[PDB]
Design a protein around this ligand. Structure first.
Ligand SMILES: *[C@@H]1O[C@H](CO)[C@@H](O[C@@H]2O[C@H](CO)[C@@H](O[C@@H]3O[C@H](CO[C@H]4O[C@H](CO[C@H]5O[C@H](CO)[C@@H](O)[C@H](O)[C@@H]5O)[C@@H](O)[C@H](O[C@H]5O[C@H](CO)[C@@H](O)[C@H](O)[C@@H]5O[C@H]5O[C@H](CO)[C@@H](O)[C@H](O)[C@@H]5O)[C@@H]4O)[C@@H](O)[C@H](O[C@H]4O[C@H](CO)[C@@H](O)[C@H](O)[C@@H]4O[C@@H]4O[C@H](CO)[C@@H](O)[C@H](O)[C@H]4NC(C)=O)[C@@H]3O)[C@H](O)[C@H]2NC(C)=O)[C@H](O)[C@H]1NC(C)=O
Ligand SMILES: *[C@@H]1O[C@H](CO)[C@@H](O[C@@H]2O[C@H](CO)[C@@H](O)[C@H](O)[C@H]2NC(C)=O)[C@H](O)[C@H]1NC(C)=O
Ligand SMILES: *[C@@H]1O[C@H](CO)[C@@H](O[C@@H]2O[C@H](CO)[C@@H](O)[C@H](O)[C@H]2NC(C)=O)[C@H](O)[C@H]1NC(C)=O
Ligand SMILES: *[C@@H]1O[C@H](CO)[C@@H](O[C@@H]2O[C@H](CO)[C@@H](O)[C@H](O)[C@H]2NC(C)=O)[C@H](O)[C@H]1NC(C)=O
Ligand SMILES: *[C@@H]1O[C@H](CO)[C@@H](O[C@@H]2O[C@H](CO)[C@@H](O)[C@H](O)[C@H]2NC(C)=O)[C@H](O)[C@H]1NC(C)=O
Ligand SMILES: *[C@@H]1O[C@H](CO)[C@@H](O[C@@H]2O[C@H](CO)[C@@H](O)[C@H](O)[C@H]2NC(C)=O)[C@H](O)[C@H]1NC(C)=O
Ligand SMILES: *[C@@H]1O[C@H](CO)[C@@H](O[C@@H]2O[C@H](CO)[C@@H](O)[C@H](O)[C@H]2NC(C)=O)[C@H](O)[C@H]1NC(C)=O
Ligand SMILES: *[C@@H]1O[C@H](CO)[C@@H](O)[C@H](O)[C@H]1NC(C)=O
Ligand SMILES: *[C@@H]1O[C@H](CO)[C@@H](O)[C@H](O)[C@H]1NC(C)=O
Ligand SMILES: *[C@@H]1O[C@H](CO)[C@@H](O)[C@H](O)[C@H]1NC(C)=O
Lengths: 133, 453, 48, 97, 49, 49, 44
């Protein structure tokens, strides 16, 4: 904007800095990435969804997350991060299943299928009873 | 009232179709707040002091989670009608002579299916709503930089709150609105809800018009005029999305309320509340432990007050949205899937048919009513009978016994209650009733029901 | 730490809040028993 | 003491706004309601207005709830007197009970 | 007072919005006068009532 | 400090007044709609309910 | 057979407590009157 090294948002939060090296840096609080947990009581299993975050950025930003999340992100496991329309998710497998009732909704007509005592991503699609011409 | 026998009644001679617009909200924006981050911002000294106010954060989280769960249940209940609603396929563009092009979703030969109708596209383009970064908002807020119109969305990752996505994507809402459009046509003389008749839209409209006091002869003569008036009424509401429209203004009011709640939540973090600074780091850097506690406590108290106010208003709006959603279900069942005999519930005038389209955070209704424009003063009678030792008196059915004029030898006719068109009295439009003192005595001219053949 | 005291006054089970996401959920809502659902959780893991 | 609440407007710093309509408009509204009670009863629409007297409208309303025409003709004066007694009894019904 | 934010402006806006909504609500109820057909009643006695 | 204590007390009073005023406005709007329904059903017609 | 049913009333005997005579009365007032086609309809 001008000859200023600090960038502030409308609410006076420091969001950007210009450094001596010549780079520009985005400034965020040490806990910024939203985290939500999908838990199933019957099987005592859980999964993690990072809302509105690209999977690639989640790999770089690990210091906010818990120890097991850090270990799983570093381990590059097979059930690793999957990009959905509601953010990056861990512990899910992409399936083409279609359901009409959901107990663990994720938004945008997405559903989570708990494992029988990983989680499966299903979709909510409704069907009319009959069509009469 | 007239001084002769009988009574004067104003019967319309010309009519037009009026449209009443109504907006009903169904859901609000779901918000979750990270209480620990919002209050203490990761500083252990603040968190130690926060314990003296009890388990504040856990209660805040539980209350917000319960509110979101209730809203999800409420919206799920409304959309469940799709599973058990019988529907019939409508024609493209013209269904007889009525034009329903704008209310239908345009079919595409190749590509991605559309989820918005022409009228819905017109409605949504008139309302400014920020995109709440459902998929990649966190990255976009960094790649785009600080923007005044987008600071409310990007404040999620600084203040410590999250905007949850809605339960259903817009494709589900489009399916719901298309389901409503395909269930309007049906039978009208049945006394149940267990049978579905595949009656065309035009015949259903004509049956609805015949039940409000318009005879079959008038409908047959004025078929094209009625169709043209209906098309003119439907086409006139495409350009009715202006600031003068109160119903359209309430949609923007709902959007502004949703924005205002997050604006209030975000702005409270910049207040000092009487402390030397609004930042915990500044307090720790400028003061020593004996004096830091008081300033940190002042900030804690201010932020706790802000969170309590936000939670209370969020619960209020959730309850109001649930009641409004129930009202929407009642409006759909009464005005959309059937014809209403009530006054004032489905628009003004005599109700004929209603349509429902998707709207931001709710539904938009178009109530079509029968609106007369001109009237005629007609002389009417309570009943008619001959002069015999036993009398047989008759009364009109759904109409009036009137004389054929606009201003002992009088000739009586029958007319519909909603349109003036005299026609001979038969047993179709009359029924036998008991003897009444105010009934006319017909000496010479007798209708066939009154003839002792 | 999240501690549960039995009827006799002893600690029967405990939760390390910063271990995994399930522990974070339990410490965020301060309950060992949590119903099935989707919950937003806070951060309890500290780093240098 | 009874007026300190009103006079506190100019000391505390709040204002009581007048209502949108004066009482004459409200009187016009109530008179409008009284003049629309009478009308037809056997029609199936809301687009026609019939200038039926109040007494005939009341008798039509009574005939539709299960009272035959012969009973109404025989008991006309009794029905009118009972209605007048019912209307006049509510003048003194503004009590704390 | 500035350290508590724009308190007074928010208070004024909230009260103004509430009053505006009440004015709209009362205006809607009284609009029936314009399109209500009426007939003149008699003074005192209308038949026997 | 003393001026701040007075400011905090008066801000709390104003917030409480605004909240209750909005509550009563919403209740009055719903009651007004009920009045319109009562007029249309009981006053201008005969009710079968 | 041709069976009839009352319209907006009841088919009652004229008494307050093979040769019985049936009448018609309104549902909201007791006043027996002869049964005609005005106050009756054919049913199954
Ligand atoms: C069972 O039910 C299932 C769920 O209902 C259903 O599955 C769904 O199917 C539909 C239809 O097939 C899918 O819709 C499509 O979604 C595409 C992806 O959307 C996401 O991503 C975009 C951004 O794109 C980036 O990411 C995608 C991958 O995700 C990538 O492919 C792309 O290259 C980019 O990298 C994002 O914009 C979307 O989010 C916005 O839109 C949502 C609604 O669709 C909103 O809910 C959300 O809030 C976002 O809203 C904002 O942005 C929009 C757009 O600017 C604004 O209008 C709005 O105001 C707001 O700002 C989402 O995260 C999407 O790309 C695709 O788009 C096409 O189709 C629509 C509708 O016709 C057009 O509007 C688009 O322009 C575009 O049309 C044309 O599409 C063809 C073919 O793809 C392209 O070749 C053309 O170029 C393109 N034309 C133009 C001009 O762009 C469409 O929306 C949906 O995702 C599925 N949901 C799932 C799988 O969960 C399933 O079919 C049902 N099954 C049965 C049997 O019925
Ligand atoms: C993976 O998930 C997607 C939904 O996100 C499934 O649907 C496919 O999505 C891709 C990418 O948008 C489209 O190009 C395909 O056409 C979609 N297919 C269908 C049938 O809708 C996809 O099938 C999933 N893959 C699996 C389960 O292997
Ligand atoms: C009902 O009113 C309409 C609108 O005024 C009348 O339409 C007019 O029709 C005449 C021919 O009869 C045209 O010359 C006029 O231009 C029309 N007026 C318009 C379009 O505003 C219609 O005739 C009336 N119907 C009646 C009297 O039965
Ligand atoms: C039915 O109404 C639609 C609009 O709702 C009409 O379509 C328009 O037609 C005009 C004249 O050709 C075009 O200029 C517009 O672009 C069309 N609008 C659309 C497609 O949205 C249609 O012509 C009407 N049908 C009939 C039979 O009159
Ligand atoms: C009612 O009276 C009207 C006129 O007031 C009649 O309409 C006329 O009918 C005659 C005879 O068929 C025609 O020559 C005229 O052109 C008609 N006038 C108009 C303005 O249409 C009507 O036929 C009468 N209805 C009856 C007797 O049932
Ligand atoms: C039709 O004729 C009958 C005759 O039965 C008239 O009924 C009389 O009405 C007057 C008041 O108008 C009563 O005082 C008489 O007692 C009635 N007579 C009988 C025998 O019941 C009736 O008024 C006439 N209808 C008219 C003139 O419209
Ligand atoms: C029904 O029965 C009552 C008596 O229970 C009849 O009323 C009597 O009718 C006779 C003959 O006209 C009169 O002399 C009596 O004074 C009447 N009694 C009373 C108390 O009014 C009545 O007529 C019968 N109804 C019929 C046969 O339809
Ligand atoms: C009735 O027709 C529909 C198509 O219109 C068909 O799907 C359905 O099976 C038919 N029902 C019966 C009972 O034959
Ligand atoms: C600043 O406000 C103006 C006027 O509303 C708007 O056009 C412009 O985009 C805004 N600038 C930014 C960076 O948001
Ligand atoms: C004081 O109160 C009494 C009793 O209510 C009342 O009659 C009197 O008018 C009051 N005096 C003033 C000055 O308001």
């Amino acid at each position: 904007l001008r000859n200023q090294r600090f960038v502030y948002d409308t609410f006076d939060n420091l969001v950007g800095y210009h450094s001596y090296n010549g780079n520009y840096y985005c400034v965020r609080p040490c806990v910024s990435v939203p985290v939500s947990v999908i838990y199933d009581k019957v099987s005592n299993s859980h999964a993690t969804l990072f809302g509105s975050v690209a999977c690639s950025h989640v790999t770089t930003m690990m210091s906010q997350f818990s120890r097991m999340t850090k270990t799983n992100l570093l381990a590059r496991t097979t059930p690793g991060p999957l990009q959905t329309v509601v953010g990056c998710a861990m512990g899910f497998i992409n399936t083409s299943m279609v359901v009409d009732e959901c107990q663990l909704p994720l938004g945008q007509s997405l559903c989570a299928i708990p494992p029988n005592p990983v989680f499966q991503i299903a979709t909510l699609n409704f069907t009319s009873p009959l069509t009469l011409a | 009232p007239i001084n002769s026998t009988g009574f004067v009644v104003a019967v319309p001679t010309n009519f037009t179709f009026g449209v009443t617009q109504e907006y009903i909200e169904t859901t609000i924006q779901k918000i979750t707040v990270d209480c620990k981050q919002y209050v203490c911002n990761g500083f252990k000294k603040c968190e130690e002091l926060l314990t003296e106010y009890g388990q504040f954060c856990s209660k805040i989280n539980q209350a917000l989670h319960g509110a979101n769960l209730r809203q999800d249940e409420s919206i799920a209940n409304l959309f469940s009608s799709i599973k058990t609603q019988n529907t019939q396929p409508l024609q493209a563009g013209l269904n007889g002579d009525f034009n329903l092009t704008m209310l239908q979703i345009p079919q595409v030969t190749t590509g991605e299916r559309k989820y918005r109708s022409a009228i819905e596209d017109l409605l949504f383009n008139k309302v400014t709503i920020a995109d709440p970064g459902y998929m990649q908002g966190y990255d976009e807020c960094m790649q785009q930089g600080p923007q005044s119109a987008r600071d409310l969305i990007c404040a999620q990752y600084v203040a410590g709150y999250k905007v949850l996505p809605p339960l259903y994507d817009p494709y589900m809402e489009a399916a719901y609105t298309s389901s409503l459009l395909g269930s309007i046509a049906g039978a009208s003389w049945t006394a149940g809800l267990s049978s579905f008749a595949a009656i065309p839209f035009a015949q259903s409209i004509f049956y609805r018009l015949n039940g409000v006091g318009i005879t079959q002869q008038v409908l047959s003569e004025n078929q094209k005029i009625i169709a043209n008036k209906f098309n003119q009424a439907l086409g006139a509401m495409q350009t009715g999305f202006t600031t003068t429209n109160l119903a359209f203004n309430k949609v923007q009011d709902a959007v502004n309320a949703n924005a205002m709640a997050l604006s209030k939540l975000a702005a409270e973090l910049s207040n000092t509340f009487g402390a030397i600074s609004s930042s915990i780091s500044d307090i720790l850097a400028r003061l020593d432990p004996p004096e830091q506690e008081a300033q940190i406590d002042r900030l804690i108290n201010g932020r706790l007050t802000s969170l309590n106010a936000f939670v209370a208003q969020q619960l209020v709006r959730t309850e109001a949205a649930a009641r409004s959603a129930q009202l929407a279900q009642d409006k759909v069942n009464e005005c959309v899937k059937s014809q209403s005999k009530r006054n004032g519930f489905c628009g003004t005038g005599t109700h004929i048919v209603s349509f429902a389209i998707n709207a931001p955070n709710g539904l938009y209704f178009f109530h079509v009513g029968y609106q007369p424009t001109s009237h005629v003063n007609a002389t009417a009678a309570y009943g008619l009978c001959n002069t015999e030792n036993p009398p047989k008196c008759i009364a009109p059915i759904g109409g009036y016994f009137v004389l054929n004029q606009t201003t002992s030898e009088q000739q009586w006719y029958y007319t519909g209650s909603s349109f003036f068109h005299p026609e001979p009295i038969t047993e179709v439009n009359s029924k036998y009733v008991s003897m009444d003192v105010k009934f006319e005595n017909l000496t010479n001219k007798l209708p066939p029901p009154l003839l002792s053949n | 730490y999240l501690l549960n005291f039995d009827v006799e006054g002893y600690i029967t089970k405990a939760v390390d809040c910063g271990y995994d996401d399930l522990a974070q959920l339990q410490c965020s809502y301060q309950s060992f028993d949590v119903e099935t659902g989707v919950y937003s959780v806070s951060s309890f893991e500290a780093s240098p």
